[PDB]
Ligand binder design. Structure first.
Ligand SMILES: O=C(O)c1cc(=O)[nH]c(=O)n1[C@@H]1O[C@H](COP(=O)(O)O)[C@@H](O)[C@H]1O
Ligand SMILES: O=C(O)c1cc(=O)[nH]c(=O)n1[C@@H]1O[C@H](COP(=O)(O)O)[C@@H](O)[C@H]1O
Ligand SMILES: [Cl-]
Lengths: 197, 199
């Protein structure tokens, strides 16, 4: 069902082309922004559903769910509300200022927390949230992400005991967009070539 | 309403002791809904009651926005359940490299409904209203689960915003007494505190 999902994303302007610098400091000709999904109720639901379905298809076990701040937060909420799962919230809005504790919700050490994320590049953002949760005594083995950019994330997460499960890779997303005439072939070629370097 | 209060009790939402509120006054009671994320059924019920309050008021709006932070998931559930477009206010500490203040599709002149967990002075609601107004949205109404009855309705009215409350602190204390979760002493103590706090 990726074709409709990707089009849906394109139509909330999820795909930005231009010259960007990523969290990891990499230049990129493309930037994928899922903040707009909250403007299209059905699309937000579709994204929540496919994320959850990805976790279920993998056959994994978890007691609770945490979104990586900020864009993934509503996705976690919809998943948890629809499927009746307790949720944890990592509060990042005051960063490391003062001494208030960073994680909201019921933390029962030994329980497994599933991570929900929007886009993974290097993997560092997921891992930062993973470490925070592990330091509270929670077990964390799996992360589900909507878009894997395929820039080292799976391998970096696996090096820390985390299995990355993605709905779609960047290359598959670019292929759908070209097939659907949303982006031209030269842009896809340029974007792929650039990323490779 | 009773069942909703019981759920809130279970997620330890009612704290007693001595607390300084954001408005700088001391209080014998604090209502902390942060634990509601651990009970998705209760979260949904809270979300539904807030939305029904708006619907029974016959107000109209184009989008919905929660006051940071506890209410963010309540707005998300209202919007998800009822298929309403959402805005998210992103409140941080004005550090270097902050991003836009409101996420989602902003159509200037459209009307945004504000959703809140607890109102005391009304200042927290008003801050969010002003951010949305600056971004070009019309705001006329706020729905709050618990109105602590410390001048919120008036403060908000003074800035053109009508506060609708699901429940007041007075009422919630009565329900809590009925359910034998709080004694006839601390009920009086908190009651006395409410008239005191209006000064
Ligand atoms: O900055 C990125 O690398 C990034 C690329 C992109 O296409 N979309 C995007 O949202 N990002 C943001 O950067 C974070 C991922 O970068 P890593 O921490 O390197 O995986 C994600 O959580 C995104 O929020
Ligand atoms: O500090 C409060 O007033 C307050 C009291 C309370 O019982 N529960 C509670 O959550 N608050 C928080 O304080 C703010 C409400 O205070 P005002 O900004 O004065 O209306 C909101 O951010 C509330 O979430
Ligand atoms: Cl949320």
């Amino acid at each position: 069902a990726l074709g409709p999902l990707v089009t849906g994303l394109y139509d909330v302007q999820a795909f930005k082309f231009g010259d960007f610098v990523l969290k990891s400091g990499l230049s990129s000709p493309i930037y994928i922004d899922l903040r707009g999904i909250v403007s299209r109720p059905r699309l937000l639901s579709q994204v929540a559903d496919i994320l959850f379905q990805t976790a279920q298809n993998a056959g994994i076990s978890f007691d609770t769910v945490c979104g990586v701040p900020y864009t993934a937060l509503p996705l976690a909420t919809v998943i948890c509300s629809t499927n009746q799962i307790p949720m944890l919230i990592r509060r990042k809005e005051t960063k490391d200022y003062g001494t208030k504790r960073l994680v909201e919700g019921t933390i029962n050490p030994g329980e497994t927390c599933l991570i929900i994320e929007d886009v993974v590049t290097s993997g560092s953002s997921v891992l930062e949230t993973v470490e925070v949760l592990q330091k509270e005594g929670l077990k964390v083995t799996d992360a589900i992400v909507l878009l894997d950019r395929e820039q080292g994330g799976k391998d970096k997460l696996q090096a820390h005991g985390i299995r990355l499960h993605s709905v779609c890779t960047l290359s598959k997303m670019l292929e759908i967009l070209e097939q659907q005439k949303k982006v031209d072939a030269e842009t896809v070629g340029r974007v792929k070539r650039f990323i490779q370097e």
